[PDB]
Design a protein around this ligand. Structure first.
Ligand SMILES: NC(=O)C1=CN([C@@H]2O[C@H](COP(=O)(O)OP(=O)(O)OC[C@H]3O[C@@H](n4cnc5c(N)ncnc54)[C@H](OP(=O)(O)O)[C@@H]3O)[C@@H](O)[C@H]2O)C=CC1
Ligand SMILES: Nc1nc(N)c2nc(CN3c4ccc(O)cc4C=CC4=CCC=C[C@@H]43)cnc2n1
Length: 186
């Protein structure tokens, strides 16, 4: 729960969003990976937890909120109550991270996942300490208005393998993609 995980899908031009949606048509197999990695806790009786920005929360289809079988935290400086369906609201990333480390969640949270958007990735990546980046490389260019921060290879190590993550190039709807895991210690 102390390591922080970010998970993202990014185009060749580092794009992650366009007009409050994704730059590419729906990649349901890519979504299945997102679901699996964020939902699968390491121990029965604990749930994983997802943190996301307010725009990402409202852009997720209503029928799929909250992200099922995960504790959902939404970051907003303007909302005063958690959005309907969200488990917690936090006014800053540090407030959220401090909440998660409170003892009355000890038994109640396994892995922590940052799931977007651009804003939130940026802030998480500015932080000292142990960060993993679960990056899906969409091997194609797409017109985008929201983007993922630079991944400095002097700071992040590309893990050659990672448990439960397959390395082969995948394809759906003629769009190729592959799964990568990066790590920054300390
Ligand atoms: N893997 C992928 O490809 C993903 C792509 N996306 C893309 O991201 C795009 C949107 O990105 P972006 O513009 O960053 O919008 P965000 O997803 O970051 O959501 C915006 C909200 O984030 C809140 N927020 C961010 N940081 C903080 C903080 N430290 N404290 C409190 N609130 C915070 C802001 O609240 P307030 O305004 O009140 O300050 C803002 O309202 C979407 O179009 C989507 O397509 C999203 C998820 C995944
Ligand atoms: N690997 C990876 N990592 C992510 N963080 C990720 N996030 C999403 C976000 N997403 C989704 C998040 C959850 C969900 O059930 C469906 C979607 C589908 C469409 C979406 C449209 C616009 C904005 C957000 C929304 C979709 N795919 C993703 N894949």
């Amino acid at each position: 729960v102390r390591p922080l995980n970010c998970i993202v899908a990014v185009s060749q031009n580092m794009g992650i969003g366009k007009n409050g949606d994704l730059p590419w048509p729906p990649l349901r197999n890519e979504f299945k990976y997102f679901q699996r990695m964020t939902t699968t806790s390491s121990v029965e009786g604990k749930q994983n937890l997802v943190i996301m920005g307010r725009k990402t929360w409202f852009s997720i289809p209503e029928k799929n909120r909250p992200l099922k079988d995960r504790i959902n935290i939404v970051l907003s400086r303007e909302l005063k109550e958690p959005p309907r369906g969200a488990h917690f609201l936090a006014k800053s990333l540090d407030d959220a991270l401090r909440l998660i480390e409170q003892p009355e969640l000890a038994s109640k949270v396994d892995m922590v996942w940052i799931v977007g958007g651009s804003s939130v990735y940026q802030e998480a990546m500015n932080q000292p300490g142990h960060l993993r980046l679960f990056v899906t490389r969409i091997m194609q260019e797409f017109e985008s208005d929201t983007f993922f921060p630079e991944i400095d290879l002097g700071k992040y190590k590309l893990l050659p393998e990672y448990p439960g993550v397959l390395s082969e190039v995948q394809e759906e709807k003629g769009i190729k993609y592959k799964f990568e895991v990066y790590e920054k210690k300390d």
